[PDB]
Design a protein around this ligand. Structure first.
Ligand SMILES: *[C@H](C)[C@H]1/C(=C/c2[nH]c(/C=C3N=C(/C=C4\NC(=O)C(CC)=C4C)C(C)=C\3CCC(=O)O)c(CCC(=O)O)c2C)NC(=O)[C@@H]1C
Ligand SMILES: *[C@H](C)[C@H]1/C(=C/c2[nH]c(/C=C3N=C(/C=C4\NC(=O)C(CC)=C4C)C(C)=C\3CCC(=O)O)c(CCC(=O)O)c2C)NC(=O)[C@@H]1C
Ligand SMILES: *[C@H](C)[C@H]1/C(=C/c2[nH]c(/C=C3N=C(/C=C4\NC(=O)C(CC)=C4C)C(C)=C\3CCC(=O)O)c(CCC(=O)O)c2C)NC(=O)[C@@H]1C
Ligand SMILES: *[C@H](C)[C@H]1/C(=C/c2[nH]c(/C=C3N=C(/C=C4\NC(=O)C(CC)=C4C)C(C)=C\3CCC(=O)O)c(CCC(=O)O)c2C)NC(=O)[C@@H]1C
Ligand SMILES: *[C@H](C)[C@H]1/C(=C/c2[nH]c(/C=C3N=C(/C=C4\NC(=O)C(CC)=C4C)C(C)=C\3CCC(=O)O)c(CCC(=O)O)c2C)NC(=O)[C@@H]1C
Ligand SMILES: *[C@H](C)[C@H]1/C(=C/c2[nH]c(/C=C3N=C(/C=C4\NC(=O)C(CC)=C4C)C(C)=C\3CCC(=O)O)c(CCC(=O)O)c2C)NC(=O)[C@@H]1C
Ligand SMILES: *[C@H](C)[C@H]1/C(=C/c2[nH]c(/C=C3N=C(/C=C4\NC(=O)C(CC)=C4C)C(C)=C\3CCC(=O)O)c(CCC(=O)O)c2C)NC(=O)[C@@H]1C
Ligand SMILES: *[C@H](C)[C@H]1/C(=C/c2[nH]c(/C=C3N=C(/C=C4\NC(=O)C(CC)=C4C)C(C)=C\3CCC(=O)O)c(CCC(=O)O)c2C)NC(=O)[C@@H]1C
Lengths: 160, 66, 160, 49, 159, 159, 160, 160, 159, 161, 160
């Protein structure tokens, strides 16, 4: 989170936290309560978000759920949905943290390599995340949606 | 001068490397006493863990010859 | 790392989405935050004095400073006060963070082994840390003191 | 390493001033960083730069 | 080092000049060589698939991949498949060389200690190596498989 | 000591001691007996040197022994005199060694940091050492005084 | 041997062996049988090659076998001939290996230092190797001689 | 490192005692020996190459070690062994000037046994070589110097 | 020179000259006048020293002046003597400087490489310098000889 | 660097000549001056901080430079200027012991003008400070030493200007 | 300034400003008008603040204005007051900037060195700044005073 980042910069400089740095920490702690609510909303709607996004993705990409495609078959389709669920969980973690770092360590480093071994198409995964964003945005209020959008966008950018 | 023998492991969290990194990952080294302080901090900042520290050369609690 | 991130990490290993109970812990932290920021600023401003007072309480006028003592000679004296400074800085970082982990990652790691090779006396060091805590407690004020004390105690326990 | 730290030209002249340093590296008791430090902390460096 | 150099080294410690008996051992290696080259080319072309199949057999659909497992998170997953690739590449090198020494010098040395610090599970890794061996055996064909298997087994025993 | 310094330079260069270096060692061993006497003289006069220097310092700097000042009070004044005694002992060690290195390790590294924590003024400490030098010079013969002066000057320079 | 060389280059590049590299290995294994015969020839003629070369060397350099010279005396002369024999054995090893590496490790690294301690003149040693080459060339067939010459030349270059 | 003069100083410093006549006498003893030591050091430096040669001749060469399958077989190993011999000689000379064995401990002696055991270098043979160097050195330096020189050589031998 | 060496060490440390360093400078300036005389003596006897040393060297090493040897022939023998003369001049420079540095720059750096290209044997050159030392020692008074010896020894050590 | 003794040697070495009486006399001259120089150097080292203080008081401080908009305004710039002053003093002391101006050229003088011009540091003011240090140094060292000390200070001043 | 600090962090990361960072900039620009008023108040009261603080300092430290002391004499006392005025001007600059950086570059880097050459005692200077803070606090409203206090505290910390 923001606080960790501030501490880390201070430690590198080997100095106590600057007033400005301290102020940013104060702002973040005030924002946190609002952030928690946004995260809570998505958590409650999680099951539906995943389901709706999955359907959209499969409509957008018939191929993935086709005999050739990776997603095809019950086992495989479940795994694809599980992946979507994982990414949503990561996004919620991000919102509460106020930073993408939590998201980034768990999901975005080595993602290309992992999916290439699996042979899953990376662009399709990105589309699924985009789909989840749209569903999530609708349930969220506009200002809340914008905050959530940033984290969703980062994921889409990372998996490109 | 006093010398430190240090064994430390640093994980590569930022990026995965294809070439063998074993020497970088796990290293036993001799450090000048003066340098060690800074080096210890650098390992901490990296997020590496210092498995073992010993004073290779010199005498503990020496006023002179340090 | 941070209280917020610690909660996140615990949930991530479980694979659980963030839940209300988790949210409550995060909420608790957010309220405490403002107090912590004020305490940190106090400590930074009075850091030199805090060290001076603590040294006066425990380190100086002692066998250590007398010839044949660990802190005898200017070089050793300077080293000891440098160490005192680090303990103070890291404790301040920990207090802001709300997490003991940074102390483990930064201060506590490799300290015991270093001290044993050097022949630095652990109990005396612990005494110094406890002295700093007492001085800090006064300056920060009671609400802040409780929070500050736990990190100081954590450092002391680690060294011992 | 000799060529990085000294320049190419000076590195040619080196025969074995640092033979003891080399052995510690060969032994894997010092790191490459440490070896570079000590080349830097050397009379030859000082004389040449 | 290599089979050819191994023979040479054995003679050198004895101080003996090269003899017909020694030459025969070298000759034996030379006949095997052609087969080995063919096997190596097969492995290189199918390397990505070999790793995929072996992972499918052991690593994936497992607790490791599930949260709280060693191979959980993309970073860890990628690391594990990188390690698998290393083992494959080195085994191929060893097969061409006809000597297990390279495995000891590069792969085997310090790996156990590294893994213990990391908390990587050795037995699971060994399982993965064995899986790769089985897949490799199929592709290379029987004559090549025997030669390939020994190096895979050597890695497994070391780990 | 002179010899330690020479050896250390040689070891860095990884060479045997240079003729010039050897010559300096020869000169030092000849000087040593004279040096021992100089040190002995100061040791005997130590108590008086410290006392006289203290008085001079306090006259030079009224502030240090004033309610604001660090030296003020019996406990503090004793500590200030103890410090002067310490520095004198270090100087004697230096004269016998023929080098400031022994002095330097015990007294001059971290001195600034130590005194800053104490809040003792560094310039006043320097004045005290200067005062001690003047007292010491008077008791010493001229040539002896010059030798002693160098070590005293180093201390003043260091702080 | 050659194959080791190829593997080492691949490992540095962190890649599987290139087709071209593999082809060179194939060529080498075919050549090996011919190489073995060349080595066998020199081994059989070894005793005479050494003897003839020694005589030539002593004629070329009277000084080495003179009271001042290192080679002087029966014990010393034997040792000088033993050295020539050693180098011939190394050359044979090289031919079968197809690389100078076997030769190089045993004979060419630290050679200067060893001989300087002994006080043996390095140029004279080189002349002895040259002499051995000439004798060896005569017994070998022309194409075989060229192959053998390369290894002999390397030795002469190394001790120079 | 440490020397005789500094060793006395350090012992007094830990006691906090001013230098006393008894201490002065030890220093005086060193000063008389000093002139002899300087002369010895110059002798050793000039004859260093020969000293090593003679010692090797006495113990190392014409032995199984130099013969194939011996530790000092191959040029590389031979060169290493004579390099080590030079080290011992240089450090012993340093120690003799210093009048203290500490430098030997700090540079040469520390970790040597362990290194040699891993390498498979034979300690007893090395010790033999050191003793041989001592004998050669003794001759050149002359009797008064020899006694002083011998103790440092013996110290190295005992450590190994 | 002594002074150059001291200054250089100080500059590296970024400090003023230490008392010990200053003392060595003082000793050197006192010694200098005596040193000048020692150098003057050797310069006057230079021609004879070289001649005598040459003869000794050739007796010690017949080989160098033999058809195989580098020194053989009038032209070559002259060059060998010229080299001996060069080294003597360098030694005189060293004595006045009180340090080998002047000697070292002109004669000892790259010496191995130069002679190896020439193919001149380095040990023989060293013997010649040793021979020159013995001749020089005889002409010099004992204390003077010891001073000169150090510089001669350095040269022998360097090659 | 070079010193007086080495300078004589080097001149002879390029000629290839053995040391001659005329050369010896130059060396002898240096040796007599040497003792004085050593005493002067010790004086300067002990009083270095004060020398700088006095010289600054004479020229640098209580001036437009220290006032806002001046080159030495702000703590950082002030500290830099006194650091430079210390450099000049240390090097001049080295030169005085050596008896040769070369070290000044090799370390201090080379590239200083260009550095100062880029920085916008005023050369004439710096020269003024050097001259002030010389005057203070002259007093402490005493007359015989002062003449020797002065030449190196003047050399620095000429180089900068 | 706050904005400069944010830009600098972004440039180090080589990224466009984060939304969160942008939000902090927005907050700062809103706060600025209030900050300007706080600065204006201190500027108007500047003359009196300096005068009052000076008197307090001289009472706290008789020594500084004593014949021995640096401050003693009219010229010297004026300079001491001028210094106090300088620090006050710096503090005002800081408040408008919202960061200590403006203060820091002009006043806190090399301050130790400058004062040591002058021989002015650093702790006394710190006391003067503390004194100025107390006077300034009284004139300022409580919340305004807290803002001003932070900058004053930083100065006191810097001069330690
Ligand atoms: C769905 C959008 C797409 C899809 C998914 C898919 N995934 C798998 C198998 C795996 N996916 C993962 C992914 C993760 N594991 C992690 O730890 C993380 C980070 C938190 C991720 C994102 C993994 C490791 C597996 C292996 C199985 C397991 O983990 O138990 C499959 C099955 C293919 C297979 O061979 O296993 C599928 C189908 N496929 C598509 O084409 C969709 C676009
Ligand atoms: C995969 C079959 C199993 C697995 C692997 C795994 N490894 C790591 C991390 C590392 N592995 C190594 C090992 C090597 N480095 C080398 O040079 C060689 C030989 C050429 C090897 C084999 C190293 C050094 C690391 C550290 C990362 C780095 O790149 O430096 C992990 C991740 C653990 C971590 O925290 O890094 C994993 C998961 N573990 C399993 O669970 C599989 C059964
Ligand atoms: C006298 C010239 C000045 C002075 C002295 C003063 N010193 C202290 C306290 C201490 N001084 C030392 C000094 C040393 N310890 C060492 O190991 C060495 C090196 C050999 C030295 C020189 C120490 C360690 C202390 C701490 C107390 C202790 O020894 O236990 C004080 C008292 C300050 C306090 O609060 O303790 C004083 C007054 N004071 C001046 O102002 C004089 C100019
Ligand atoms: C002071 C309260 C006590 C004390 C301290 C002391 N420490 C040293 C030397 C070292 N201490 C450390 C410790 C750390 N290095 C780190 O990276 C961290 C975390 C930020 C710590 C706490 C280290 C590495 C050293 C060695 C070199 C250095 O100076 O850093 C000494 C000197 C001992 C010696 O023999 O030189 C001392 C005296 N000892 C006491 O007397 C107090 C009780
Ligand atoms: C002959 C061409 C010249 C010559 C020879 C010579 N050699 C020695 C002594 C030794 N030679 C060796 C060399 C080797 N050891 C190895 O491992 C290898 C590579 C396989 C070689 C070439 C060794 C070890 C010795 C030492 C004695 C021993 O056998 O253990 C001598 C004797 C001189 C001495 O001091 O021992 C001589 C004369 N010298 C000449 O003049 C010829 C030009
Ligand atoms: C000669 C008397 C015996 C001998 C020597 C020998 N030594 C090695 C290898 C090493 N020697 C050292 C030792 C030192 N390194 C240093 O820096 C110092 C202090 C100045 C010493 C004394 C080291 C560290 C090594 C290992 C690394 C290296 O190669 O330098 C060998 C080589 C062994 C091998 O298998 O490569 C040898 C042969 N062995 C003998 O036969 C003699 C009895
Ligand atoms: C007052 C609290 C203390 C005190 C002050 C004092 N200062 C001086 C002289 C100067 N102080 C400065 C300071 C600054 N210049 C800058 O650029 C800045 C930042 C903007 C500061 C703070 C300077 C440069 C001078 C030199 C004077 C000049 O302009 O030339 C004096 C006079 C001493 C003298 O010899 O000049 C005094 C008395 N003295 C104390 O002891 C008080 C604790
Ligand atoms: C003081 C008399 C005058 C003055 C000086 C001044 N200098 C700087 C900055 C630098 N000064 C140097 C100079 C040197 N570096 C060298 O290597 C040498 C030769 C030995 C010298 C003399 C350098 C390189 C710097 C820049 C880096 C640094 O600060 O360390 C400043 C600061 C300029 C700025 O704008 O920051 C000043 C003020 N200026 C005066 O007013 C005096 C006339």
């Amino acid at each position: 989170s923001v606080l960790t980042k501030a501490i880390v910069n201070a430690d590198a400089e080997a100095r106590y936290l600057s007033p400005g740095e301290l102020d940013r920490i104060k702002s973040f702690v005030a924002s946190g309560e609002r952030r928690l609510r946004i995260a809570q909303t998505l958590t409650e709607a999680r099951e539906r978000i995943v389901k709706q996004a999955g359907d959209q993705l499969f409509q957008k990409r018939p191929d993935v759920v086709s005999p050739g495609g990776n997603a095809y078959g019950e086992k495989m389709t479940a795994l694809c949905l599980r992946d979507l669920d994982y990414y949503l969980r990561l996004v919620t973690y991000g919102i509460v943290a106020g930073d993408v770092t939590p998201i980034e360590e768990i999901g975005i480093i080595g993602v290309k390599e992992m999916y290439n071994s699996l042979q899953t198409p990376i662009p399709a995964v990105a589309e699924g995340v985009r789909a989840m964003k749209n569903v999530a945005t609708s349930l969220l209020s506009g200002d809340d949606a914008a905050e959530a959008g940033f984290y969703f966008d980062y994921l889409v950018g990372a998996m490109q | 001068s006093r010398y430190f023998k240090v064994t430390a492991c640093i994980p590569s969290l930022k990026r995965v490397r294809t070439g063998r990194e074993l020497q970088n990952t796990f290293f036993t080294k001799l450090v000048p006493y003066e340098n060690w302080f800074t080096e210890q901090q650098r390992i901490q900042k990296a997020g590496g863990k210092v498995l073992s520290v010993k004073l290779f050369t010199g005498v503990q609690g020496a006023n002179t010859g340090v | 790392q941070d209280a917020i991130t610690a909660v996140i990490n615990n949930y991530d290993v479980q694979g659980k989405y963030l839940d209300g109970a988790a949210l409550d812990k995060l909420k608790a932290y957010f309220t405490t935050g403002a107090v912590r920021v004020r305490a940190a600023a106090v400590i930074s401003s009075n850091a030199t004095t805090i060290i001076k007072e603590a040294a006066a309480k425990a380190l100086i006028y002692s066998d250590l400073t007398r010839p044949g003592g660990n802190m005898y000679t200017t070089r050793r004296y300077a080293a000891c006060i440098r160490d005192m400074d680090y303990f103070l800085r890291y404790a301040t970082y920990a207090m802001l963070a709300g997490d003991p982990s940074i102390l483990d990652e930064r201060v506590l790691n490799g300290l015991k082994e270093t001290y044993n090779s050097l022949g630095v006396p652990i109990a005396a060091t612990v005494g110094g840390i406890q002295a700093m805590k007492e001085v800090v407690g006064g300056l920060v004020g009671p609400d802040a003191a409780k929070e500050a004390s736990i990190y100081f105690d954590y450092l002391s326990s680690g060294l011992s | 390493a000799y060529v990085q730290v000294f320049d190419k030209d000076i590195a040619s002249y080196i025969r074995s001033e640092f033979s003891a340093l080399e052995s510690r590296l060969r032994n894997r008791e010092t790191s490459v960083k440490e070896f570079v430090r000590l080349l830097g902390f050397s009379a030859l460096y000082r004389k040449q730069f």
